Amino acid sequence: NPKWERTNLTYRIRNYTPQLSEAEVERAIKDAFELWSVASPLIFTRISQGEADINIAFYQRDHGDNSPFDGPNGILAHAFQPGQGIGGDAHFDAEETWTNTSANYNLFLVAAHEFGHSLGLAHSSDPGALMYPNYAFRETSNYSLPQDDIDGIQAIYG
Ligand SMILES: CC(C)C[C@H](C(=O)NO)C(=O)N[C@@H](C)C(=O)NCC(N)=O
Ligand SMILES: [Ca+2]
Ligand SMILES: [Ca+2]
Ligand SMILES: [Zn+2]
Ligand SMILES: [Zn+2]
Numbered sequence: 001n002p003k004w005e006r007t008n009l010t011y012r013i014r015n016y017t018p019q020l021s022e023a024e025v026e027r028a029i030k031d032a033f034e035l036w037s038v039a040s041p042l043i044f045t046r047i048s049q050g051e052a053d054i055n056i057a058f059y060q061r062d063h064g065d066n067s068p069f070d071g072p073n074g075i076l077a078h079a080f081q082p083g084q085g086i087g088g089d090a091h092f093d094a095e096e097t098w099t100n101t102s103a104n105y106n107l108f109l110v111a112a113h114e115f116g117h118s119l120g121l122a123h124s125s126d127p128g129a130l131m132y133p134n135y136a137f138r139e140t141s142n143y144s145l146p147q148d149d150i151d152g153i154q155a156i157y158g
Contacts, residue, residue: 001120001156002081002082002083002087002120003082003119003120003156003157004042004053004082004088004119004120006053007041007042007043008042008043008044008045009042009043009044009045009053009054009088010044010045010046010047010052010053010054011029011033011044011045011046011047011052011053011054011055011056012046012047012048012049012050012051012052012054012055012056013025013026013029013046013056013057014055014056014057015057015058016058017058017092017094017098017107019097019098019099020098020099020100020107024100025098025107026046028100028107028108028111029056029107029111030046031108031112031143032108032111032112032114032115033115035112035115035143035144035145036112036115036116036119036145036153038145039145039149039150039153039154040119040153040154040156040157040158041157041158042119042157053088054088054089054090054115054118055088055089055090056089056090056091056092057089057090057091057092058091058092058093058094058098059091059092059093059094060093060094060095061095063091065086065091067091069091069093069094069095070093070095071093071095072095072096072097073096073104074093075093076092076093076096076105076110076135077090077091077092077093077110077113077114078090078091078114078117079091079114079115079117079118080117080118081117081118081120082118082119082120088118089118090111090114090115090117090118092107092110092111092114098110102137104135104137105135106137106140108140108143109130109135109137109138109140109143110135112130113130113131113135116130116131116149116152116153119153119156119157120156121149121152121153121156124148124149124152126146126148128146128148129146129148129149129152130145130146130148130149131148131149131152
């Protein structure tokens with residue numbers, strides 16, 4: 001069970017996707033972290049530069065980690081479990097269409113999914129859970145953590 005033994009975690013958005021504005025990208029990312037926050041003791045702080053616990057980058061194909069991305073559709077992103085260095089980090093395929101809408105793919109929902117992984121959650125078999133292996137759009141306005149996911153971080157932390 002890898003878990004962060006610290007509660008306030010910093011994150012850094014290393015670059016951006018041209019699909020969305022930077023403000024929309026930053027809002028998608030911020031709201032995704034807030035979901036886990038309201039159900040756990042973790043507090044997340046954005047830093048503009050510098051080492052951050054959770055680095056967030058939009059990369060393409062080979063991007064230095066032995067987990068190359070694959071062009072449109074297919075794998076949308078991946079994150080690493082709690083740890084130093086790459087631990088906790090989250091990469092998004094820069095080749096996907098990232099959206100703010102119901103169109104494929106909504107960055108907020110994919111981000112929320114990746115962060116569960118950065119906090120030490122794996123995939124759930126529950127199709128209604130956010131940690132479900134495959135993406136499905138769900139209304140994002142006043143969006144809240146499904147009970148399955150709530151049970152998962154709460155079993156890791158408090
Ligand atoms: C290549 C492996 C790690 C699959 C990858 C994933 O689950 N990352 O957490 C992924 O892109 N899964 C697809 C099926 C996806 O839509 N994931 C994000 C989602 N659940 O929102
Ligand atoms: Ca890290
Ligand atoms: Ca892809
Ligand atoms: Zn990667
Ligand atoms: Zn996943």
